[PDB]
Ligand binder design. Structure first.
Ligand SMILES: Nc1nc2c(ncn2[C@@H]2O[C@H](COP(=O)(O)OP(=O)(O)O)[C@@H](O)[C@H]2O)c(=O)[nH]1
Ligand SMILES: [Mg+2]
Ligand code: NI
Length: 215
């Protein structure tokens, strides 16, 4: 419970700051940073970002180039984020005034479809991206990751035809694993899909949905 304890303590601070916290998990390159870049275009969607990578400030810089307050966590070798890692980034974002102006604090986890599924970060929602080029068979291959999802995003949905990707396969696999979890088709080329997902998040904050998932 060491991480579990720390996650619970971070959740105290999230609520204190009036933040709805999202934890995005996927394979490397599923489209997380691009999605956040596109979400920044919705003025009614106010958020700051904690970025998890092994090295470089490449994702954080892309986001800051778009006007999003973002801070990079460099894990060095760790394949995942842990609750204790969030604290440092949280404190900086607080001191910078980023938290005061945000309705959402968004955690972009280390690219990894396995290990981040085992670490509670105190998030209200844990959302998993599965990109079309990865294959429509991945849900059952990484069941523990997809079972922690409060929502699944099929990203790069513009690529469905060229990859002969079967949305039905993902739907049916998720039906077995976690039927309550909604599935979203998303493309960076489809503003309407971004808008739909944004409104979904807004409503979730409204309800104050808080995942009870055990990691
Ligand atoms: N075709 C297509 N490409 C995308 C989409 N979203 C992201 N990409 C591309 O996928 C690559 C990796 O995206 P990135 O945002 O870095 O994903 P991340 O590593 O998970 O943060 C980049 O070349 C993006 O241009 C999409 O919806 N459709
Ligand atoms: Mg990224
Ligand atoms: Ni690992």
């Amino acid at each position: 419970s060491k991480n579990d304890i720390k996650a619970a303590e971070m959740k105290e601070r999230y609520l204190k700051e009036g933040l709805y916290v999202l934890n995005f998990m996927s394979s490397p390159g599923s489209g997380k940073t691009t999605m956040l870049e596109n979400l920044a275009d919705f003025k009614d969607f106010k958020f700051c970002v904690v970025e998890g990578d092994l090295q470089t400030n490449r994702d954080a810089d892309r986001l800051r180039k778009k006007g999003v307050s973002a801070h990079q966590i460099t894990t060095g070798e760790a394949c995942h984020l842990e609750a204790s890692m969030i604290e440092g980034a949280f404190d900086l974002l607080k001191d910078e005034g980023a938290l005061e102006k945000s309705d959402f604090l968004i955690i972009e986890n280390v690219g990894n479809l396995v290990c981040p599924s085992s670490y509670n970060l105190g998030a209200a929602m844990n959302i998993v991206l599965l990109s079309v080029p990865e294959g429509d068979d991945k849900v059952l291959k990484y069941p523990t990751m997809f079972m922690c999802a409060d929502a699944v995003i099929i990203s790069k949905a513009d690529m469905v035809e060229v990859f002969n990707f079967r949305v039905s396969q993902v739907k049916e696999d998720m039906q077995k694993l976690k039927p309550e979890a909604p599935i979203f088709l998303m493309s960076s080329k489809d503003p309407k899909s971004l808008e739909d997902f944004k409104n979904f998040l807004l409503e979730k904050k409204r309800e104050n949905y808080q995942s009870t998932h055990s990691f």
